[PDB]
Amino acid sequence: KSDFKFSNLLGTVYRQGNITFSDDGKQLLSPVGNRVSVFDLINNKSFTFEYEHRKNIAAIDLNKQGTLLISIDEDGRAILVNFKARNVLHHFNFKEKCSAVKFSPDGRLFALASGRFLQIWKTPDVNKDRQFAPFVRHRVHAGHFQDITSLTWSQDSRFILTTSKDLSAKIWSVDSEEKNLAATTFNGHRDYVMGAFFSHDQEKIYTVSKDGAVFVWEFTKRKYSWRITKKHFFYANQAKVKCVTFHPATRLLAVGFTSGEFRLYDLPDFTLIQQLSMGQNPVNTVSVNQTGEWLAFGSSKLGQLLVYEWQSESYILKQQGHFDSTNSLAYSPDGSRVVTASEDGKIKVWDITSGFCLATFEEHTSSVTAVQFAKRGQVMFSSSLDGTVRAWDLIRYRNFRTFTGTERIQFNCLAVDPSGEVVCAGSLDNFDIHVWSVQTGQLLDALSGHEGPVSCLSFSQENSVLASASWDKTIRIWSIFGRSQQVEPIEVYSDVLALSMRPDGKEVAVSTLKGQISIFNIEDAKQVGNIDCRKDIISGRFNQDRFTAKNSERSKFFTTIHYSFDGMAIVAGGNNNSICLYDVPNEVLLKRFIVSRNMALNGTLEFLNSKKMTEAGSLDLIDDAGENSDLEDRIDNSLPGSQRGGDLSTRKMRPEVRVTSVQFSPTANAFAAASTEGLLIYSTNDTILFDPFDLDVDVTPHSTVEALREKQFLNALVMAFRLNEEYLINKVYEAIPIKEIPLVASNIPAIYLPRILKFIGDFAIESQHIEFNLIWIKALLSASGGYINEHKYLFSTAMRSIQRFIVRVAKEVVNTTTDNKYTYRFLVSTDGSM
Amino acid sequence: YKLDVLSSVHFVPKPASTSLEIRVETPTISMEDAQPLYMSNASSLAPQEI
Amino acid sequence: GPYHIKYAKNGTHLLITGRKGHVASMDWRKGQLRAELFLNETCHSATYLQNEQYFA
Amino acid sequence: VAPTALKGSSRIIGINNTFESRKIMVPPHRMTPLRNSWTKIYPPLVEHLKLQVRMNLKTKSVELRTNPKFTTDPGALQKGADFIKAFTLGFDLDDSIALLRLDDLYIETFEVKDVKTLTGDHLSRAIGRIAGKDGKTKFAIENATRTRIVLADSKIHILGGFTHIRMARESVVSLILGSPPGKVYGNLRTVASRLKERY
Amino acid sequence: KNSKIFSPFRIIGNVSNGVPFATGTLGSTFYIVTCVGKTFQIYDANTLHLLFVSEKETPSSIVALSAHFHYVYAAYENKVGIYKRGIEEHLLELETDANVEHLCIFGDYLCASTDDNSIFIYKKSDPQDKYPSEFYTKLTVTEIQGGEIVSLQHLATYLNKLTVVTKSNVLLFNVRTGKLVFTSNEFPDQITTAEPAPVLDIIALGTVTGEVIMFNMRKGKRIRTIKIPQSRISSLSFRTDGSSHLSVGTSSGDLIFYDLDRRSRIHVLKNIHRESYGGVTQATFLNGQPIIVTSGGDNSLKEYVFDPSLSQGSGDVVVQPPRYLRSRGGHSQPPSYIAFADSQSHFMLSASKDRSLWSFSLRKDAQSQEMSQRLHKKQDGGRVGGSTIKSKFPEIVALAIENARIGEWENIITAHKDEKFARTWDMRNKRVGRWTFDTTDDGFVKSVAMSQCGNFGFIGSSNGSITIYNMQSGILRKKYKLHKRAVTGISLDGMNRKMVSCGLDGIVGFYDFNKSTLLGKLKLDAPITAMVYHRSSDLFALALDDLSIVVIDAVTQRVVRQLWGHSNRITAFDFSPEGRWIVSASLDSTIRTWDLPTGGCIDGIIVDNVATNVKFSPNGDLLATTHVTGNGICIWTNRAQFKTVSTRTIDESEFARMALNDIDFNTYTSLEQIDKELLTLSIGPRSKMNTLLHLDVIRKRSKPKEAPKKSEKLPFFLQLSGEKVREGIAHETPEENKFKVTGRLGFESHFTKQLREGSQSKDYSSLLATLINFSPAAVDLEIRSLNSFEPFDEIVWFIDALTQGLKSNKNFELYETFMSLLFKAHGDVIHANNKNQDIASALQNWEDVHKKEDRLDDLVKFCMGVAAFVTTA
Ligand SMILES: [Mg+2]
């Protein structure tokens, strides 16, 4: 039930730091703000780790073997992670700003560029158990006079090249006895040295500067010494080199410029293979696959992540995410895809498994406030502050209809009829709920009666009534359908901020500004429960506040809520650092989730460090933009009074942790919450828990197996559920012969029917036994079809899961089979000659 | 743009106006973003439109 | 920190400017503070004008 | 060397090119191009491969022998012999040098009669079809499959990577048989894309 | 004795065990090396932050510690180890069974004194070598020469002389020549300490009867005699800040200071350390500063500072008294109860028999703090009844903590020994609360519990009554009276609905907390000693008197599992956070892990000291246990969180003497195909089929909108010219005749060879295998490259191969998809030559198979018809 865990972060593909491909090249590791996300391009799956830094990530690296991941934040704090097990081995502090961390290709040593020192450490062994001090230092090198920009390992794990802001590139030897081999310093660059590299033979060293000069260093006579034999120049008019990488095997040099264009060159010939432009923002990080075929680029400003297959001039991956912009989210009815509305005005559809944007729509001029699907799922609606309501048809990606009010009113909330024929929107400026007809587009009527702005709307899926709530401290139930129109107002203690309708359509829950979730019965218009939330909410002091968090009244209410499709649970979130999941019937908090643990965000901490406070003020509030070397960093474009609706640069204040909207998954036991960092998806998929149901001494994982060996399938299957072990249920599920399925299916007790249907839904989507599952689904529905119909909402999520399997994979297979059959008949039956 | 950000985007919508767009028949996959997946396959013009 | 220091021409007064924006003007021999600004900005350098009365 | 330093098959197919010796006969039409380009043909054989080279005016052949005291790479003789043959077959000198430089380049040779027995104007018709107007068709095949082709009357020689010459040869054969030009062009577009792709 | 699930991590809560610490200076800064049993810790003198710990636990307890710059020498039994940064670099093994007692290092010489009055001298192999390793010689002091050795010391400006101090008298040994240079006069009192003075040739000697002697070695004569009647000296140290002060530590727990110049006492610090644990075991002035670091056996380390004199002139006479500066500490006696404060491995509460309750930080020792006991003033206004002399609260027997309401009001309840009420504490403020809960039946508190919401507190009395209070206001709300004997456990489920209790009478009561009704009662055979309730799974285990752990399901009120095997009482036990394991400890000196699904012991340990408490972290990553001996907490890492653990039951007989694999690892792998008749898809991503059918269209999207400019002068064969690996179909090499369109022999492609071999052998299984392995781009290339010219051999062979594939009923979507591509690329050739027999028969054989795979459509259509109907109407 209430055992949820963070699974993946959608809405963000790159924030800052360096991107790294996996050694096999089939996985891309992208730092997304405070966490590390892994995308499996080949298998179309993605996950984001649970471990969480206290600040944004600055650098990462995965060793060649693929077992250990090291990530370093902007303060130098480092977390070592066992990649296969997805667990944290050890937290390490390097007490400096670490710029780059790179594993040696052998894997034994990893080097760190911290300030002006190059630190070489010994890797902890993954097989060994955890220890107090796993890292063992090897050596610290201090030759540079200023900070190190980047470092490169030699292919034989014996030399390291470090490029610093001293206009110098310097070479070390990891072995003391070999110091005489390489103790040289390379000079002659006009600007910072961005990168230095070896050739495949290690006889040529290339150094690249920010101004755009590439030097080829060779060991030659003028008695022998390193010299610049040849010199090359990127004649970029004003762009400065921002990131450089080199692939020795293919002699490829990928350079990303601050103007947003990147160039690919061949060394030592310096023939320009290509150059493309990904935008007007700098190319922050570039990486190369091991084979050298895929180049991954990243732009921090707009959060673009691009993987380029330069061989075929193709895009494997091309995505753009959102930061501090996701204002809403809406699940597809099957739950396969999630929609988001951003302040930019762009509606983006993300696929849950892959984590990538399937489609983007940019019709809306201003911020989109809310999004909702039709009950059918083929159509989508969205409301924006530009003054319009727009209907989207997904099958053809067309704005097939657009509605607009007469009086030029901003829209903030939206609700669509179950029949997909009426659309109503509310405003913060009009006090009236406009209603339109989907088929014709005309304004049917303007519902009036509120003395305050309408904060939220929702249709009953069954009864088709409309429930509206406002800051007027009231809730009104409109029977708009029917010959006669009726309005039934219900009073509340305080302003209403959010509203959710039970799938039954018999009750409505409303969150008030007092921090109260009140559940009312629609037909009786009387209260049936109340839940306190003010104590549960976790709110943090901002760096700018002059008052404590406890006395702070900034956000102690829930601005969004939603029922579980079963109808027994409510998930709530607000302008705060908590997502609270309440159980409706007993009015208790099942669990509380911390949205973020990043101190870069403003609202994360309840108690701030006293050291930061001074006579001058909080050290965080001092603006240090002047120190930044590049002009584009120093320039301040912030408007004095802005709070929302523009770029981060406009704010001048740190982003604030908040959950714009939350929703449950129609198909799986999971929920998605849009926040500043992105869409946090919490799921119970791992299900490591042991939650036996009606267990007894006679039931045992050992005992179940004989029931199979003795061919007592029903007793084996029922005993498998009582333990509720997935691996055991799977074992019994596949060992039952097809002949006995119709016999067993009829005899399953009614209590365990919801569980098996959930299992088949979760198992069938990714399992390879399409027909065997379909035999099972046919058996169960025929045997217990009547029971399922009587209890719709107990089986709602399970039933949707089965349909998603039957439509999304099963239908696609036969759709080709029927295709080949007809293409077959035409070729043979037809006459072809001449 | 500057005024809207200054007012925290509590502005008033602009006059509605009618404009003409040209829709070119293309496979629906082309309209999508670039990754190893597509979510629809139909054409971008309905049969009536053809 | 870090702090940039500039003495007056006659050596009677001292001007220190922190990088984080702490500017102080004082008479260092007699331990008298003339002015102390806590500008929340990035100060780079400061100098005394014709006399200790004005500084930039 | 920098202080950081680390610590007989024939490429041509369809013709028998083979202290060891190799002899390659030069046809009359390649005599003059061989002459003015010999200032750039003998160096790479004698310095890189460490071979001994001559032109036999009496027999009009290029004679190549291994020096036991100087030559070191056992495959140098065959490598050098193939390089001369590519120049003999009509490929430009820089293309021929690629065989010395690269170790994964193969020459496929075949005649129109091998694919199908064509004679008279029909044989002329096929050579016209392979060539295309102003050489467009062969140029398309060359660029799409990343191959160099020399269409010497009824004899075709294709230089490039293994699978590349396999695809260039297939397109040429399809042209000889009489497949519709559009189908051949349609493939020539997509063969290029598939070859360069990683997956 | 080695667990397969757990492994030691470190010990929390120890700063010093009583062995004299050693001070070491790196540059200007100083560090302190303290002994903790079998390992040592290095603290920074400035902040008393932990820096390093010994990598491995020494086999035997450490006896002496000496530190010189980076290197630290630790002596245990007959071996002296050399450590750098907490990692051993070299081990010195003495040749005599006698255990080392004292240790001195000067220059290249390392001197070790054994208990048999034998001094071993080691020397550096090289003058520039960092530490001595080589064995130089052996010097033995006989009883005629002197008594037992008290300590070894080396005065400054002495070439190769070691000042051996014995109880009887002092001796001077020349290590280089190994000859006794000088012998002191016999002293009347037994010497107990020796400290070189900052002056030349003078070493301070402390006797057992409170005499401090400023013995001058060069003159061999006494210089001064301080007298401390009725005291025993334990440490001596000199102030090097330019003031002639001497700090004289005593075993009674006092530290006296003398000003040698003025022959007067500056001050006395009384009871800085407990006398029961050895008093001031060591007190050392930091070199050249007024800070003195003091330690003792009570598990504490303190620092005191001399402030500057408050008089402008005559600063020498007006000396400010020493002032407490900073310290670190722990329990003086083993902890009695423990609990994890927060969901993370964040903080850990510990209460000990020394009547002090501590909050220990797992992640930084500096964060550890003692929960103060200062009381609030009563709300009523009446005076609080208590002895004027302040005394710590009695020992904490039971503890319960919740965090649903941390920072709003009290969130901890504690029960005290022989006390008729339970006190409250607040974790956020780190101080005792303002509420006291009384049993109201004249009975001692035996059990305390908290509701998850953090509103209620349950107190279980020894007389059988359960009283329920409200934490916010400390007002009694309800009292339940079922048990007649002592209640030994109380718990409430997460939903705050069903409450369960247990008592010595052996009955387990089931209550409905909302309605205040008795749902049911269960009688067990034996008295119940303890209870652990798992809220996520609604299972609670009961430690019965008959050496069993009985697991019960609160929902149905029946015994679900019973665990046997402990040979004595079960001290404590806990549930794993995932609800799958129970770890229990017993007086027979073992810890056993029980796998609840199978109900058997999977791991067993034999602990030298009985484990009095066992507690899992809520994460499950760490297991913490406390023992009857040792002032600290033993922390164990859970190996199960990084790899699977076999659930095979442990061997009982072997465990006593010391004092299906898929099922064993709780995993299962789905079959490749249940039945040959059942259709089965491919073992791979499901986007493979969609990608194959629409390869070209997806690529068109992938292309950039604007063409990329390229250099006019580029190598034609750049792609081939890659120094060396790419495995693409582009990178294929031939494997070793008339020209053939499909492929010349020796030049053929691997795919064609497998096809042609398949045609002759009449089995394409090898070809189907490689086709599935092919990437989508490769598959399109091969299908199109098939020969389409008469007699159409390759096309016909390909159809038979795919016809063979469908018969298997495996990977049928990919075999199907290949035929969609075959028609797309070669549809016209098939159409034009449909009358050809080889194509017609090959196609006809295919149709007969493909017609059989039509049952799938019937199932798919049926399920949609009902699934839409059932879910709708
Ligand atoms: Mg009426």
Coordinates of C-alpha atoms in Angstrom, one line a residue, chain E residues 534-665:
Chain E
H534 CA 6.3 -4.0 12.6
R535 CA 3.9 -1.4 11.3
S536 CA 4.4 -1.8 7.6
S537 CA 3.4 -5.5 7.6
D538 CA 1.3 -5.7 10.8
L539 CA 3.4 -8.5 12.3
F540 CA 4.8 -8.4 15.8
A541 CA 7.2 -10.8 17.4
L542 CA 7.1 -11.8 21.1
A543 CA 10.1 -13.1 23.1
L544 CA 8.6 -15.8 25.2
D545 CA 10.1 -17.1 28.5
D546 CA 10.6 -20.6 27.0
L547 CA 13.4 -19.3 24.7
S548 CA 11.2 -18.8 21.6
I549 CA 10.3 -15.8 19.4
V550 CA 6.6 -16.1 18.5
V551 CA 5.4 -14.1 15.5
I552 CA 1.8 -13.1 15.4
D553 CA -0.4 -11.3 12.8
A554 CA -2.4 -8.6 14.4
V555 CA -5.0 -8.6 11.6
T556 CA -6.1 -12.2 12.2
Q557 CA -4.9 -12.8 15.8
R558 CA -3.1 -16.1 15.1
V559 CA 0.5 -17.4 15.5
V560 CA 2.0 -17.3 12.1
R561 CA 5.6 -18.4 12.9
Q562 CA 7.5 -19.7 15.9
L563 CA 11.3 -19.7 16.1
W564 CA 13.4 -22.1 18.2
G565 CA 17.1 -22.5 18.9
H566 CA 18.2 -20.0 21.6
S567 CA 19.9 -21.8 24.5
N568 CA 19.1 -19.0 27.0
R569 CA 17.0 -15.8 27.6
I570 CA 16.6 -13.5 24.6
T571 CA 18.1 -10.2 25.6
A572 CA 16.8 -8.2 22.7
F573 CA 15.7 -8.4 19.1
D574 CA 14.5 -6.2 16.2
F575 CA 12.7 -6.4 12.8
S576 CA 14.5 -5.6 9.6
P577 CA 13.1 -2.5 8.0
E578 CA 11.7 -4.4 5.0
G579 CA 9.9 -6.8 7.4
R580 CA 11.7 -9.9 6.1
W581 CA 14.2 -10.7 8.9
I582 CA 14.4 -10.8 12.7
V583 CA 17.7 -10.5 14.5
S584 CA 17.8 -11.6 18.1
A585 CA 20.4 -11.8 20.8
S586 CA 20.5 -14.1 23.8
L587 CA 22.6 -14.7 27.0
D588 CA 24.3 -17.6 25.3
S589 CA 26.6 -15.1 23.5
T590 CA 25.1 -15.3 20.0
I591 CA 23.2 -13.2 17.5
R592 CA 20.9 -15.1 15.1
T593 CA 19.2 -13.8 11.9
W594 CA 15.8 -15.4 11.3
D595 CA 14.3 -15.5 7.8
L596 CA 10.5 -15.0 8.4
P597 CA 9.2 -16.4 5.1
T598 CA 10.9 -19.7 5.8
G599 CA 11.1 -19.4 9.6
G600 CA 14.7 -20.6 10.0
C601 CA 18.0 -19.3 11.1
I602 CA 20.1 -18.2 8.1
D603 CA 23.1 -16.6 10.0
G604 CA 24.7 -16.9 13.4
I605 CA 27.4 -15.1 15.3
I606 CA 29.3 -15.8 18.5
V607 CA 30.0 -12.5 20.3
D608 CA 32.6 -12.4 23.0
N609 CA 30.4 -10.1 25.0
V610 CA 26.7 -10.6 25.3
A611 CA 24.7 -8.3 23.0
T612 CA 22.3 -6.5 25.3
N613 CA 20.5 -4.7 22.5
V614 CA 20.1 -5.0 18.7
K615 CA 18.6 -2.3 16.5
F616 CA 18.3 -2.0 12.7
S617 CA 18.6 1.4 11.0
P618 CA 15.3 2.3 9.3
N619 CA 17.3 2.4 6.0
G620 CA 18.5 -1.2 6.7
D621 CA 22.1 -0.3 5.8
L622 CA 23.4 -0.4 9.4
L623 CA 22.9 -2.7 12.4
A624 CA 23.8 -1.3 15.9
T625 CA 24.4 -3.5 18.9
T626 CA 25.6 -2.8 22.5
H627 CA 27.4 -5.2 24.8
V628 CA 27.7 -5.8 28.5
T629 CA 31.3 -4.5 28.3
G630 CA 32.6 -1.5 26.4
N631 CA 31.4 2.0 26.8
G632 CA 30.7 2.4 23.1
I633 CA 28.3 1.1 20.5
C634 CA 29.2 -1.6 17.9
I635 CA 28.1 -0.7 14.4
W636 CA 27.6 -3.4 11.7
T637 CA 27.1 -2.8 8.0
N638 CA 24.5 -4.9 6.2
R639 CA 26.1 -6.8 3.4
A640 CA 22.7 -7.8 2.1
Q641 CA 22.2 -4.3 0.8
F642 CA 25.0 -4.8 -1.8
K643 CA 24.5 -8.5 -2.7
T644 CA 22.0 -11.3 -2.3
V645 CA 22.1 -13.6 0.7
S646 CA 21.5 -17.3 0.6
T647 CA 18.5 -18.3 2.8
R648 CA 19.7 -21.8 3.4
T649 CA 19.2 -22.7 7.1
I650 CA 22.4 -22.7 9.2
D651 CA 23.9 -25.8 10.6
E652 CA 22.9 -26.1 14.2
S653 CA 25.4 -28.7 15.3
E654 CA 28.3 -26.9 13.7
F655 CA 27.1 -23.6 15.3
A656 CA 26.9 -25.4 18.7
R657 CA 30.5 -26.8 18.3
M658 CA 31.8 -23.3 17.6
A659 CA 30.3 -22.2 20.8
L660 CA 16.5 -24.7 -5.7
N661 CA 19.2 -22.1 -5.7
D662 CA 16.7 -19.8 -7.3
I663 CA 14.6 -20.3 -4.2
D664 CA 17.6 -19.9 -1.9
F665 CA 18.4 -16.4 -3.2

